[PDB]
Amino acid sequence: NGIVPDAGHQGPDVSAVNGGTQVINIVTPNNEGISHNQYQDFNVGKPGAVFNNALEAGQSQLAGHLNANSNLNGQAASLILNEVVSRNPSFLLGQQEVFGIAAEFVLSNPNGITCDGCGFINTSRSSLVVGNPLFENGQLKGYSTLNNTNLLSLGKNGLNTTGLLDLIAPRIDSRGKITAAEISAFTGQNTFSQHFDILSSQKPVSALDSYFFGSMQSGRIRIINTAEGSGVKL
């Protein structure tokens, strides 16, 4: 299993079905509508991974027939926040599907994230964050890439989604086709709001250079690099 949940109260049940497809019964959403899931490992292979945000049974694209997620207590998650709480980087080599009600989707891993032929299904917005979520008394306040020089890598097989895409990291190295409704890439050492407004920035001690190679198939692309002196190479 590529995805290994944390042992604690934010660890969802993760099961393998079929020929290796992972099914994640995400944890009960809080009052903000956030399903906050914590992981020791978060990796996706070509069989893909399905996050059950369904209030009634049905057919998933990647895992066939699934029952409803009864953790949801009749209310689907608005945001599925997946947080790696170990030192293990993430490798995403297949599709990630939200089964049931469309939601916003976040993966945070301050140790690094690599995408190569990964994608997102039934998400309104998907965000990859090489950094940590920020909490105050149980409430999500935003995200941080402070004190971090690690990499978001996008491989030759690219990344695809029909929804919005955010790429958030100290630096980004992309070598493949990125397909999305909109692409927002924010680089450097920053604190963010929940909506990825930049609230503060550090100047890195050494250059944090990002590289984008290959096509971007999107009608709207924004690249913001706050590392003063550092550049974006295309």
Add this chain to the structure above:
Amino acid sequence: NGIVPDAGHQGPDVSAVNGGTQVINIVTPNNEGISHNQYQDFNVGKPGAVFNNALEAGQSQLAGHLNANSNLNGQAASLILNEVVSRNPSFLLGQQEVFGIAAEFVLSNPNGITCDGCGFINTSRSSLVVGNPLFENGQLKGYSTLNNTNLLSLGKNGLNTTGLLDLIAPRIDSRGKITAAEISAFTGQNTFSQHFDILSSQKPVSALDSYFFGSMQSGRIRIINTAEGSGVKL
């Protein structure tokens, strides 16, 4: 002379001084604060070109001492709009300076614009438009790249400015370093407001692909391609 003014009432006086530096005494601004200058040819070499938007004499960076521009009638231009009204494409191989009061600067040429080691001095915003300005009863209404498949090219020697930069064309092919406070690149066949809000778009009959190669030295980059199906290659 690389810059040749139109014979008509929007043709400014253009003089060569020194070792080839061109000095353009821009035409009297209208009530909108726009100095609308029309040209048979608009090309800049390494000696550069200076647009006199000065209310009093002084030292220009590119052309040494210049007197005030008495066409200004005591009011400097807010926008210096340079429009090529012939079929000749533009080649910009040196710096363009606004002498005197800082202003917004536009070059429109629907036949194509090539930059290679060009730059902009004392401009708050500089825009290169492979397209035409739109007028209604003498008033600037915006810009158009409709019915146009021509190219904005940026060469290996790049483009530099301390101000904002807009790159507007059916397609863009960039091979060098672009340095600016912010970079906005809008591609495809579009109509624009004066502030380059996209108001309408055509689908080209064949793909209008843009290519960005090399660094972008800017903290904020926006790329908007309205040609449905067409991509942006980095």
